[PDB]
Amino acid sequence: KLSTTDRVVKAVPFPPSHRLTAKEVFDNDGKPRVDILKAHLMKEGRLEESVALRIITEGASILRQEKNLLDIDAPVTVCGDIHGQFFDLMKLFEVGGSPANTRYLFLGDYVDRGYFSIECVLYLWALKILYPKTLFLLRGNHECRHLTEYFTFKQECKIKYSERVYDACMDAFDCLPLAALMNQQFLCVHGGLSPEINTLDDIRKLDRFKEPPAYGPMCDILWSDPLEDFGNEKTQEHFTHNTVRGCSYFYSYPAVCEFLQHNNLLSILRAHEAQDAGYRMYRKSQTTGFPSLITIFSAPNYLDVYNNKAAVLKYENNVMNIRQFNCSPHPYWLPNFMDVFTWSLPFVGEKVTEMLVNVLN
Amino acid sequence: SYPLEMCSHFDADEIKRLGKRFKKLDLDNSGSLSVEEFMSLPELQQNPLVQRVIDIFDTDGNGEVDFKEFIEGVSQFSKGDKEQKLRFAFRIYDMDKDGYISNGELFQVLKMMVGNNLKDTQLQQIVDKTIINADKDGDGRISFEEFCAVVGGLDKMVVD
């Protein structure tokens, strides 16, 4: 007979009950110890609420002081969607270079879909505090109250921490910049262009400190996608209704080219869409021979079903090297952070009923 | 023969009707239902919770279910209370019948149901985290009150 009290699979690491305090996370100079934080979060360890709130608020204050359109220089590693895949985020930093000597730019979508979203926020916000001038974070369409409540990030914060941590993340997501001008060559956004954004100054005049509205320029920055037949100019309309997203627009190849020529830009770097190879390059511009649009997806094995590779753009020495990497193992979670009792109880009542009605028939 | 004592919500006609059904299931007329006699019904041969229900009905722990254990077990799964149906489900997980759901028995009961749909390491992880989030007094196990605080709002456990 197997022990009814002892853990059956003893060698499986048990998540620690110790919650990191302020002295364990922040040193005497106020710099967060990302190595202590990394090892603790990888063990599914949690922080004290006041410590987690301090990381979120101090990171939000740094983001609030930044402009809507960031001015980022090369070299830099550009990263796509993360979607709460914390253990894949650790491989990303191994693959793209240490943030202590490598410039970083994330295109948003740090939460939802994955079940380690708060760990991604806490670790990236801590790196933002530790490297405020070399690590940069943009806003995605998921860094909002509506999508985090429709998906599992709202529930995740209620399970692992509290709703005060969720509300602090929502105010922190309001401070995230919307775009980045990288090396005066590339426009870096999460989704894409907008019919109401024709110059880079149209981004500078936006009010980003709010929940993303259902329509408008700020909405299109986070939600717009390229046409499904991007490059094969069959739809002359530059912006058409995005029926896949239910909002924003599809933008065509002439739409991107008109923006790149008018603003003297080489390409547009965005994410928002999953790719099997971790990236996708679209039709090159006629004058440059460089892809006019590049999608980056940094979530390998998306939803643990796609079996897709991930990639980051490592731009250095006038070379944009696409760096692919595979997924990493992570502890298991039931969908929507459901416990085993809520999961199995309907099956218990079903099977016990099926047994008893057959023995009493 | 001295009278039989039992605690159930059945009237005399229901007890007699369940007695006739009990004799039919008792293939060897031994006065008790063995696991083999329960498994004689083809509908129970693929039910992964048969052995748990038998162990719950077997109050004296002799391995078989006599008529008293048969009546009282069926009684707890039909004019019953809301707490009685919720405690019967609690007893499904509580293998050692100590009043607390421990980590080992919660894994084994779940392993009976999930089969190979989850690896052992995955099931152990969600068993650990379930107890971590549901344990309120910090003893590493799930009491009945802690069990009700999780599955209280979940409304399906009645027979005829």
Binding site: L334, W343, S344, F347 | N47, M113, G115, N117
Partner: peptide, 6 residues
């Protein structure tokens, strides 16, 4: 006959 992952 077996509990499935939702």
């Amino acid at each position: 006959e077996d509990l499935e992952v939702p």
